[PDB]
Amino acid sequence: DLLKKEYTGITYISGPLLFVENAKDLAYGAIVDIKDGTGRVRGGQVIEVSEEYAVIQVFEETTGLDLATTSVSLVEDVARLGVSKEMLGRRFNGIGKPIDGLPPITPEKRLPITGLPLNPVARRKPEQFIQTGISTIDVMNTLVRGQKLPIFSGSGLPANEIAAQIARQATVRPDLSGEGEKEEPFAVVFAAMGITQRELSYFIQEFERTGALSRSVLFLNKADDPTIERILTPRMALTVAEYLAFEHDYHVLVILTDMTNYCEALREIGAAREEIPGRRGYPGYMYTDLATIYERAGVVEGKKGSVTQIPILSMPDDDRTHPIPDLTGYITEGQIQLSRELHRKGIYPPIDPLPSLSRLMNNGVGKGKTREDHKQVSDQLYSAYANGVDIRKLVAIIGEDALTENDRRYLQFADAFERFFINQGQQNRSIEESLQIAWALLSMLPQGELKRISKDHIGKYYGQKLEEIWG
Amino acid sequence: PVARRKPEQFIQTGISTIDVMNTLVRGQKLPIFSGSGLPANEIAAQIARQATVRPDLSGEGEKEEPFAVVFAAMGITQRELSYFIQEFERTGALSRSVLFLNKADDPTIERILTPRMALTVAEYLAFEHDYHVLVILTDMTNYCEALREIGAAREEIPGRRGYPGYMYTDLATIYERAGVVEGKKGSVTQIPILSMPDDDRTHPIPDLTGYITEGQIQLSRELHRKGIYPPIDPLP
Amino acid sequence: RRVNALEQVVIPGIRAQIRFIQQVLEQREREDTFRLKRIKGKIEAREAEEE
Amino acid sequence: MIQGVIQKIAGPAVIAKGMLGARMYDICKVGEEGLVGEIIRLDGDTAFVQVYEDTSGLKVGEPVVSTGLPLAVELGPGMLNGIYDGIQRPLERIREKTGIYITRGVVVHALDREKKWAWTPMVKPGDEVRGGMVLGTVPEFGFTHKILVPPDVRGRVKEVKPAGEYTVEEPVVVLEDGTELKMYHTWPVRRARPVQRKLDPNTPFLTGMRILDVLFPVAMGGTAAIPGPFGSGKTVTQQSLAKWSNADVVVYVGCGERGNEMTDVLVEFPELTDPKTGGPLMHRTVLIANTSNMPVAAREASIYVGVTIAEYFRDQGFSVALMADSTSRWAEALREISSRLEEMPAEEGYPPYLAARLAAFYERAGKVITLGGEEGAVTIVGAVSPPGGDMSEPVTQSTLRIVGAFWRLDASLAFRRHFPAINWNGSYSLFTSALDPWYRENVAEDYPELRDAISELLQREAGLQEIVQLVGPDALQDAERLVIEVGRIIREDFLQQNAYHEVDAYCSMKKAYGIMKMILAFYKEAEAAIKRGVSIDEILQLPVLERIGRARYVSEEEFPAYFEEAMKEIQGAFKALA
Amino acid sequence: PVQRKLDPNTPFLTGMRILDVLFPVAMGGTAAIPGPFGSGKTVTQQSLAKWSNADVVVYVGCGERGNEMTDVLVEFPELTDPKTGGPLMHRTVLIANTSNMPVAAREASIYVGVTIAEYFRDQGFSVALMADSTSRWAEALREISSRLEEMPAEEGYPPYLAARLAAFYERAGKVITLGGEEGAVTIVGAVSP
Amino acid sequence: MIQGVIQKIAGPAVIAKGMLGARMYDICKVGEEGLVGEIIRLDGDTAFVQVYEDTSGLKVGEPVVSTGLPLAVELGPGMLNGIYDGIQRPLERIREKTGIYITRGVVVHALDREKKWAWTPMVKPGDEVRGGMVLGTVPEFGFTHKILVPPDVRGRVKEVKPAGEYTVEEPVVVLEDGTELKMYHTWPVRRARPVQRKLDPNTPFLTGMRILDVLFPVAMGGTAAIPGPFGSGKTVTQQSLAKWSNADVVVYVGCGERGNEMTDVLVEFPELTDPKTGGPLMHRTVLIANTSNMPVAAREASIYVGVTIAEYFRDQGFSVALMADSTSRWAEALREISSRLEEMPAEEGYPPYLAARLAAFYERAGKVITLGGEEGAVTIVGAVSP
Ligand SMILES: Nc1ncnc2c1ncn2[C@@H]1O[C@H](COP(=O)(O)OP(=O)(O)OP(=O)(O)O)[C@@H](O)[C@H]1O
Ligand SMILES: Nc1ncnc2c1ncn2[C@@H]1O[C@H](COP(=O)(O)OP(=O)(O)OP(=O)(O)O)[C@@H](O)[C@H]1O
Ligand SMILES: Nc1ncnc2c1ncn2[C@@H]1O[C@H](COP(=O)(O)OP(=O)(O)O)[C@@H](O)[C@H]1O
Ligand SMILES: [Mg+2]
Ligand SMILES: [Mg+2]
Ligand SMILES: [Mg+2]
Numbered sequence A: 001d002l003l004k005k006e007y008t009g010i011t012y013i014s015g016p017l018l019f020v021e022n023a024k025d026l027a028y029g030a031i032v033d034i035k036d037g038t039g040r041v042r043g044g045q046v047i048e049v050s051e052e053y054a055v056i057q058v059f060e061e062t063t064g065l066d067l068a069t070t071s072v073s074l075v076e077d078v079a080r081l082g083v084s085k086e087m088l089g090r091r092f093n094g095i096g097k098p099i100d101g102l103p104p105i106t107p108e109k110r111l112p113i114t115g116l117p118l119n120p121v122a123r124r125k126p127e128q129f130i131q132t133g134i135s136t137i138d139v140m141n142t143l144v145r146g147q148k149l150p151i152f153s154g155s156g157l158p159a160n161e162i163a164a165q166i167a168r169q170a171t172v173r174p175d176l177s178g179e180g181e182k183e184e185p186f187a188v189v190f191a192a193m194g195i196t197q198r199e200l201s202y203f204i205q206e207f208e209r210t211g212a213l214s215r216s217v218l219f220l221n222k223a224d225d226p227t228i229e230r231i232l233t234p235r236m237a238l239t240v241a242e243y244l245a246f247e248h249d250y251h252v253l254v255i256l257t258d259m260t261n262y263c264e265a266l267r268e269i270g271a272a273r274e275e276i277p278g279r280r281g282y283p284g285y286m287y288t289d290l291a292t293i294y295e296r297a298g299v300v301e302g303k304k305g306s307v308t309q310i311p312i313l314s315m316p317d318d319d320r321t322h323p324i325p326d327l328t329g330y331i332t333e334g335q336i337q338l339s340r341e342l343h344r345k346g347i348y349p350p351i352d353p354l355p356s357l358s359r360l361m362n363n364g365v366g367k368g369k370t371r372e373d374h375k376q377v378s379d380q381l382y383s384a385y386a387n388g389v390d391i392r393k394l395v396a397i398i399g400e401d402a403l404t405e406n407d408r409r410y411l412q413f414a415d416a417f418e419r420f421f422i423n424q425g426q427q428n429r430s431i432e433e434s435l436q437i438a439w440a441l442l443s444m445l446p447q448g449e450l451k452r453i454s455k456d457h458i459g460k461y462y463g464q465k466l467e468e469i470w471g
Numbered sequence B: 001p002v003a004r005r006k007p008e009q010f011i012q013t014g015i016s017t018i019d020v021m022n023t024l025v026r027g028q029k030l031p032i033f034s035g036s037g038l039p040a041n042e043i044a045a046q047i048a049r050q051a052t053v054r055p056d057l058s059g060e061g062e063k064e065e066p067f068a069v070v071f072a073a074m075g076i077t078q079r080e081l082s083y084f085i086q087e088f089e090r091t092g093a094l095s096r097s098v099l100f101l102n103k104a105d106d107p108t109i110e111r112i113l114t115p116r117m118a119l120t121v122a123e124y125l126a127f128e129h130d131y132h133v134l135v136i137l138t139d140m141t142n143y144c145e146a147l148r149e150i151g152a153a154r155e156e157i158p159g160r161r162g163y164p165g166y167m168y169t170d171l172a173t174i175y176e177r178a179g180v181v182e183g184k185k186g187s188v189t190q191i192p193i194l195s196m197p198d199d200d201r202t203h204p205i206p207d208l209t210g211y212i213t214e215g216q217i218q219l220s221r222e223l224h225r226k227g228i229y230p231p232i233d234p235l236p
Numbered sequence C: 001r002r003v004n005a006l007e008q009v010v011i012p013g014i015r016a017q018i019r020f021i022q023q024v025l026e027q028r029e030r031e032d033t034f035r036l037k038r039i040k041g042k043i044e045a046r047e048a049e050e051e
Numbered sequence D: 001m002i003q004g005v006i007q008k009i010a011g012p013a014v015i016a017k018g019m020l021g022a023r024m025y026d027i028c029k030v031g032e033e034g035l036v037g038e039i040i041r042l043d044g045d046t047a048f049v050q051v052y053e054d055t056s057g058l059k060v061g062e063p064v065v066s067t068g069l070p071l072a073v074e075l076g077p078g079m080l081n082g083i084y085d086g087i088q089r090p091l092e093r094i095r096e097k098t099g100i101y102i103t104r105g106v107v108v109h110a111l112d113r114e115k116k117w118a119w120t121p122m123v124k125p126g127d128e129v130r131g132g133m134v135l136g137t138v139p140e141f142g143f144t145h146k147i148l149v150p151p152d153v154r155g156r157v158k159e160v161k162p163a164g165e166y167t168v169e170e171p172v173v174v175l176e177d178g179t180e181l182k183m184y185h186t187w188p189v190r191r192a193r194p195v196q197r198k199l200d201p202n203t204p205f206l207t208g209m210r211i212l213d214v215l216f217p218v219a220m221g222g223t224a225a226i227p228g229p230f231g232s233g234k235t236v237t238q239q240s241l242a243k244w245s246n247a248d249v250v251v252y253v254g255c256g257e258r259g260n261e262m263t264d265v266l267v268e269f270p271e272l273t274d275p276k277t278g279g280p281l282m283h284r285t286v287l288i289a290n291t292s293n294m295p296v297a298a299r300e301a302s303i304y305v306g307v308t309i310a311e312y313f314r315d316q317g318f319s320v321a322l323m324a325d326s327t328s329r330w331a332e333a334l335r336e337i338s339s340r341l342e343e344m345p346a347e348e349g350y351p352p353y354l355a356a357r358l359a360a361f362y363e364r365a366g367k368v369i370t371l372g373g374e375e376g377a378v379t380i381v382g383a384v385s386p387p388g389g390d391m392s393e394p395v396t397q398s399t400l401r402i403v404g405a406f407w408r409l410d411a412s413l414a415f416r417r418h419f420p421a422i423n424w425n426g427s428y429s430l431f432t433s434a435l436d437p438w439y440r441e442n443v444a445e446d447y448p449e450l451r452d453a454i455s456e457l458l459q460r461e462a463g464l465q466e467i468v469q470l471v472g473p474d475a476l477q478d479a480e481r482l483v484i485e486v487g488r489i490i491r492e493d494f495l496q497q498n499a500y501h502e503v504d505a506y507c508s509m510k511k512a513y514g515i516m517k518m519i520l521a522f523y524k525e526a527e528a529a530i531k532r533g534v535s536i537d538e539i540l541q542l543p544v545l546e547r548i549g550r551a552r553y554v555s556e557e558e559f560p561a562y563f564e565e566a567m568k569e570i571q572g573a574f575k576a577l578a
Numbered sequence E: 001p002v003q004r005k006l007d008p009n010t011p012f013l014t015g016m017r018i019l020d021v022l023f024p025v026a027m028g029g030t031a032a033i034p035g036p037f038g039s040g041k042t043v044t045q046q047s048l049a050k051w052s053n054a055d056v057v058v059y060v061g062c063g064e065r066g067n068e069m070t071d072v073l074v075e076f077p078e079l080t081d082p083k084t085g086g087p088l089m090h091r092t093v094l095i096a097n098t099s100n101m102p103v104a105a106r107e108a109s110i111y112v113g114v115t116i117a118e119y120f121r122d123q124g125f126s127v128a129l130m131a132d133s134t135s136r137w138a139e140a141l142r143e144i145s146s147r148l149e150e151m152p153a154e155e156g157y158p159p160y161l162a163a164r165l166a167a168f169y170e171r172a173g174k175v176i177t178l179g180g181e182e183g184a185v186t187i188v189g190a191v192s193p
Numbered sequence F: 001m002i003q004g005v006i007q008k009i010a011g012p013a014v015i016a017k018g019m020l021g022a023r024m025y026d027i028c029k030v031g032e033e034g035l036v037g038e039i040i041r042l043d044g045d046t047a048f049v050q051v052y053e054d055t056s057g058l059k060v061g062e063p064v065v066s067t068g069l070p071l072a073v074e075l076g077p078g079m080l081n082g083i084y085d086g087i088q089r090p091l092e093r094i095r096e097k098t099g100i101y102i103t104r105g106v107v108v109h110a111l112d113r114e115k116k117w118a119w120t121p122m123v124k125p126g127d128e129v130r131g132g133m134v135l136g137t138v139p140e141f142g143f144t145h146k147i148l149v150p151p152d153v154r155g156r157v158k159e160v161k162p163a164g165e166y167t168v169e170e171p172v173v174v175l176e177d178g179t180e181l182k183m184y185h186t187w188p189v190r191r192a193r194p195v196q197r198k199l200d201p202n203t204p205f206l207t208g209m210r211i212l213d214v215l216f217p218v219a220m221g222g223t224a225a226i227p228g229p230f231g232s233g234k235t236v237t238q239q240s241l242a243k244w245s246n247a248d249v250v251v252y253v254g255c256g257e258r259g260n261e262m263t264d265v266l267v268e269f270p271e272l273t274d275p276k277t278g279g280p281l282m283h284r285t286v287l288i289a290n291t292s293n294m295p296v297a298a299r300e301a302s303i304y305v306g307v308t309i310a311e312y313f314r315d316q317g318f319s320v321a322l323m324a325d326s327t328s329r330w331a332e333a334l335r336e337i338s339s340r341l342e343e344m345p346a347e348e349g350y351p352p353y354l355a356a357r358l359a360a361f362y363e364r365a366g367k368v369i370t371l372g373g374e375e376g377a378v379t380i381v382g383a384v385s386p
Helices: A159-169 A197-210 A233-248 A259-272 A286-294 A323-331 A340-344 A374-398 A405-422 A431-442 A455-461 B040-050 B078-089 B108-128 B140-153 B167-175 B204-212 B221-225 C002-048 D091-097 D210-214 D234-244 D259-268 D298-316 D328-341 D354-362 D394-400 D411-415 D432-442 D447-471 D478-495 D509-531 D544-549 D559-577 E017-021 E041-051 E066-078 E103-107 E109-123 E134-147 E161-169 F091-098 F210-214 F234-244 F260-271 F298-315 F328-341 F354-362
Strands: A010-014 A017-020 A031-035 A041-049 A054-058 A071-074 A080-083 A109-112 A151-153 A187-195 A217-222 A251-256 A306-314 A334-337 B032-034 B067-076 B097-103 B132-137 B187-195 D003-010 D013-017 D027-030 D035-043 D046-051 D063-066 D072-075 D117-119 D138-140 D143-145 D164-166 D185-188 D223-227 D249-255 D285-290 D319-324 D366-369 D375-384 E030-034 E056-061 E092-095 E126-132 E182-191 F003-010 F013-017 F027-030 F035-043 F046-051 F063-066 F072-075 F127-129 F134-139 F144-148 F155-160 F173-175 F185-188 F197-199 F223-227 F249-255 F285-290 F319-324 F366-369 F375-384
Touching: A031 A054, A080 A233, A109 A233, A151 A159, A159 A197, A159 A251, A159 A306, A187 A197, A187 A233, A187 A259, A197 A217, A217 A233, A233 A251, A233 A286, A233 A306, A259 A286, A259 A306, A259 A323, A259 F354, A286 A323, A286 D328, A306 A323, A323 A334, A374 A405, A374 A431, A405 A431, B032 B040, B040 B078, B040 B132, B040 B187, B067 B078, B067 B108, B067 B140, B078 B097, B097 B108, B108 B132, B108 B140, B108 B167, B108 B187, B140 B167, B140 B187, B140 B204, B140 D354, B167 B204, B167 E134, B187 B204, B221 D447, D013 D328, D027 D046, D035 D328, D046 D328, D072 D298, D117 D138, D210 D478, D210 D509, D223 D234, D223 D394, D234 D249, D234 D259, D234 D319, D234 D375, D249 D259, D249 D298, D259 D285, D285 D298, D298 D319, D298 D328, D298 D375, D328 D354, D354 D375, D354 D394, D375 D394, D432 D447, D447 D478, D447 D509, D478 D509, D478 D544, D509 D544, D509 D559, D544 D559, E030 E041, E041 E066, E041 E126, E041 E182, E056 E066, E056 E109, E066 E092, E092 E109, E103 E109, E103 E134, E109 E126, E109 E134, E109 E161, E109 E182, E134 E161, E134 E182, E161 E182, F013 F027, F013 F328, F027 F046, F046 F328, F072 F298, F223 F234, F234 F249, F234 F260, F234 F319, F234 F375, F249 F260, F249 F298, F260 F285, F285 F298, F298 F319, F298 F328, F298 F375, F328 F354, F354 F375
Parallel strands: A151 A306, A151 A334, A187 A217, A187 A251, A251 A306, B032 B187, B067 B097, B067 B132, B132 B187, D223 D375, D249 D285, D249 D319, D319 D375, E030 E182, E056 E092, E056 E126, E126 E182, F223 F375, F249 F285, F249 F319, F319 F375
Antiparallel strands: A010 A017, A010 F035, A017 A054, A031 A041, A031 A071, A041 A054, A041 D003, A080 A109, D003 D013, D003 D063, D013 D046, D027 D035, D027 D063, D035 D046, D072 D185, D117 D164, D138 D143, D366 D375, F003 F013, F003 F063, F013 F046, F027 F035, F027 F063, F035 F046, F072 F185, F127 F155, F134 F144, F155 F173, F197 F366, F366 F375
């Protein structure tokens, strides 16, 4: 038409919802603009429709709205975001508007933010090993390109510093696999849900220090921003990441700051609609909603791009059985779990190796990729550490003097393992140095009890002294 | 209640741990408590195959009276069905018994109606034709679960943990049908069988059964894993 | 010494944990009963009153 | 056909009006885009439709047309070596038609209509046919595929075409009433296929894993469940069962899990070798995939399609194995749909009819005598992720009462990388006694006695561990210390199995019997030497301990010489000690 | 209603050594005898019925197992009254319920018994009331409240359980009747945790 | 204005009808008594009002009048050395009017309209002024109180009152468009006050306690939480921080606590000495009191009023410390209000939007560069009583 239609029959405003009764023309899932009587425009999304009435959720706050003057206008039927290659180095808010003072982006394409599932035929196996520079991740919980590897954190634990260090130090090793020329740097897409000024300032300073803002795209949604806007931020971030990776052959690394806040907003919307709850408070469909976010990563046959995700989430009472960590561990391809007890002893990074897991480790290790002894060394380290922890629990009861020689050896191995292997500070370690330290630690035990390593590898590498590396 | 009389005669089940230390008396409701992997079906089949009354030890020698077994199976699978058919038909025990079977894929209301038909037949035979009958209910956990499903389908608010509030009354109308009546010669004896879901005796189903029944027989997992059959623990 | 330690320290702690867990589970069952009451009241309202 | 319009859209639910005449569980076409939906309600002139595809973008007033038929599958040649979505649409055709993304409204046939198959008749005019009888033979890889009369057809035949190559749409039967039979027929997924008779289970389903085959067997027609928290090893165990079991055809069903796990099967399997035929392993596998980010309502249809295909391959005479990736996702889908209907739920929000669905699904498994007079079997292994936290959730409790085996996994064992991490105390099986006659003939005459001795040793070890927590390992006497050490030996050597090792991934029956014999002989010798006054500490220093602990990695054909040498060394070492 | 409630000052001679000596109960007082199964509740209650110095005895079964109720129904008439040598059932009133009676009948069992005891109190007698397994009466009350959707409070019991228990026990006491005479009611109740 | 009548009463929740045209989160006058209420729902011709005072004795049919404005405070000279109710009412004026009991329906002004203040101008006619700029100074108890342009004001000035003594409600500056600027302005308590930039905290907030200063420091402009059971020492710690800390202005919020804990502060503080100026300690402290037996719905308003005043004193260039006595009572107030609305609750009956409110409240704290150019900071210490 020459001028667009407006709907005025609004009789309900309560919380985030809003009912309009003359709106059968609005498509399900459409985006609308809510006009105040003073001229202010607020956005909203339609999730119900009938010949009787329609239900609209509001992104911004509902202060100042009235039932006599408010009107609803129509934007396009599908939530679409305009993307371009020119948007590298820009900053955006939670809904995609610029906040850096620069003119807006002229779109090359406009894409639906909900995305589409990847065809399981069109995928391929993640293979490339990524050297993060942290021994407890490189050796025992290896990260490969194309993996979803969330970080399970507490309240006072430093997950942000670990994420920044990984993003700074991450690189591939073409020389080990023989793939030829060195890579190009990762492109970082940073999506922030409800985040304090302290964490945001730290992240901005860290990215400015290394010059990574020229490659990055930032979607920011602060703690004082409206809550319902957090629904759209991960979807827009992943739309941009998918476009860059699969249309321009970039290697994209995506960081999601706190999935807990996203789940809180989701619970707010679900409880407003009287949905059937899940276990504690959260709606019953939360598994499906999280699955549409995580499962957008991976690699695609016949294309050079890749998408890697590092979500960060906080287990509330350090509880692994909470619904959010449970569903995340069901969907993702592993987890890195931080330990508070190691943090209290001054160990950084405080990664607890036993609850940690990497599902796609076996694709990226072995001969011709890193080295031939990687997997057996990892297994032996795991078994020895478990024995050390069990002997700790034993000497908590019976006392140190009652120990034999074997239990004392395992106990000393566990202590030295923590102090030297885990505690590394801000230093950067290559894979060879980490393997050398791991072999030096295993040399504290007799050859008889390490049954998980083949005798050739023992004959080749066993016998190193730790004093040469640390003295 | 003024028509009943006190139970005074025993039944020889053929199992030493039950006959000697936990004697079964005509008119008693004596449940068998079992776990998940424990062989309750084999014990039930053996008891139904072996049980008989002993008139020679009673009185001067007594006069013989008929005996019968009524068997009710609720929520059994195909394997248990084939096992029970082959067990009963291979030794002539079927000639004195009545079988009510309800497979797991059968509707739930039939599972609800299954034990009441068995008890109706038992009452008819005992108090019309002076039989001594023995009623065995294969699994009460299945009955409780079917009752929960039926109650939830009719929009009834549940009770203590998940189960409906009237479950205590509903189980009582099943157990309290057994007994022995003054002025009559027949009697009805019940042996309920149930599997404890959490393997805990504080679950509502084992707890409410202890209020109505007159004892218990408990199967032991350690004796079962050691190669002992039948694994009846004499202590609890 | 071992008997005294087991009688004094371990058993009361285990008992306190047991009763705490029981109280939390009871609270959760009460809350879901309230939710069921509300949804039944909502269901019965919309089926009869509307014309 | 019944036609109507829409006035309600809310997620995966669509309510239509003007639909008087529709039937329950029919298939409807929704909107001008042509989406596939199913009817579950009737209320006056309105109907309630759940949609198997995404519903965003639809508008009120678009037409809805009912096809008048329930959900059905196409059964015939060409299903092997394929991968399908939740409603049986091939994904390779979608990949050809569309890009890397799955769009809505794609129309493709389940069976390829272009391929020509060799036909060889088995009947002549004037013969009487019946439901389930075979007539014809089509070669398909290493198998010979049989064309079956549909179960609802009876009549007399006067038409046969001679040997030639025809498409699957070519009808080569004419009955006296004039009906035609083709190489394929359609069957509704919610009706169980009829059989003639059921049979007792008397043949083991060999999985190739030591603990599952030895301690907790499952029969050829039986059912099993494997519950455990995330990261415990359900999917790896199921894929090992897919690779190494002796089933003729394996149907793998993915319900609400990751797409990378399906890509791994799609890539690795064409390289591997079929254990019993020597061809590629992918020629025997059928995949049904409905990943986690696909629409919710298709999760139930995937399970029913999988079980219907498995039942179809049973009627030909094969022994079929079925792997269900997660039934908890099916339960969550049923909870999601029930929210729109506004019903009153059960304990954890699940609908009350959930327990009947699982029972109806598991009851399809068994060894039967088919309508064609042959013998087939279907065995179902269903992984149950405990949805919220633990084993007390209603899904696991409902599964516990209808399964013959129960393989409980432990998170604590998976933390210390002790795979397969089967909890020995909380697991059981019911197929031991029935399988005992087979073991005596085919494995060894004394094999059940060895199994009972191993179980007795594990029970003795489990008994003593209570005392160890109480006083510590130093207070135990020498006999109990020996029992503890032998239990540790059994746990480290016999039970543990690496699924990614080159040799340890598969273990035959006789190798397991040899290892058990070695361990029991060592225990007997050690107890005898204890009676002669030897302290336990010097016994464990023997070099034969390393010989036993590395008997896993010996190859299958190298094993008998190793067994002979190890037995001789076992005899030699303890004779010189005292 | 009564005229005035008096303080208890005469012992309820149970006829047992330990209960009369160490832990006495006064006329008009209330006593509770709990214990798990097999402890000895039923035998003691019946001994109190047989040997006490109360003029009239009321026996209430809140709903028992059928065979035990049969046992107590058969065993009671055979005994003899220690006061006069006559039948014991001449001075007793028996309230009997099993587990398959309607749930409304079992809840109102203890109120009928206490009403009859109060009726005999107004005539000038001393009445002893024995209640068997008030836990099962509590279970009946819980089931009735679940039928009415009463939002359970402590474990499954309705929030007003303590009020009903208080209303039941407070009827016991030595009073001056409206006719100017003196009577008393003594309540002994067995609890089964 | 919009006017309507009442038809429903249930505790502190009043439902009005005939209110077509009322806006969300406005302020209404309820009944003949003239109570204060706030609208949080709209449905047809009706509105749902929560009442900040006692609703006993109300009847169906009493009139409801809407003021058309949200809940706002008066910011200006005269707030120091004062004790206020949960919706900014001076308590000593209420004592003078009613006596020793706090009755409902009392109308008082927040700032004293009859005190003379010394005025010293800064601007000249023809100057261009913006939001947050400084125009004039007024002497207070040791401090220099600056008169600020309201943040949403731009214009040019040609009128300045000369140096003299005026009340708070006399126009001292007149803009070119005719806007008159007084010594005070109003701000809605739910909106965060604008700033230019936020800075990283780098100087300590000295509390005078050894364990808190040495082991677990808090920086100037940060946030901290102090949980603990009853009898652990939260109130004594917070009062010690009020006595000894180096903040320029201390704002103390009592949200649903004992009245004795506020009477002790009222009595004892004027006898003490300010650490950094030497005057009475009460001259730097502002008290907001809402005890436990006062109306429940006024607890939220007290928190927002306190944080708004603390934000106002930040823009003048001071360093402000805010102490909240308990946020658990605020959570209980939210639970009660949601229970009147029949919303589906989260764990333990709290509404699902509970975390958003706490996030928005603590986000007000930080070290900023004010609109006028000075540097201020607000630090928040909140006690949790689980
Ligand atoms: N038998 C085994 N041998 C070696 N490694 C194993 C074995 N079983 C499991 N693992 C290791 O443990 C990991 C467990 O991942 P897996 O996919 O099996 O999890 P799951 O318990 O099925 O969980 P879910 O399907 O819910 O994500 C494997 O990726 C592998 O690294
Ligand atoms: N630092 C201290 N020095 C001396 N006495 C102290 C100190 N801290 C606490 N106390 C004592 O303990 C009491 C604790 O009272 P306080 O009001 O501080 O407790 P609270 O944790 O705030 O409790 P409430 O939840 O009741 O407000 C004080 O009244 C005082 O007697
Ligand atoms: N005075 C007594 N003399 C002998 N045995 C007694 C006496 N009192 C109780 N008992 C024993 O206590 C046991 C429990 O009896 P009873 O009270 O009938 O069951 P419960 O304690 O389970 O209610 C009986 O077996 C009985 O022999
Ligand atoms: Mg898996
Ligand atoms: Mg008793
Ligand atoms: Mg205090």
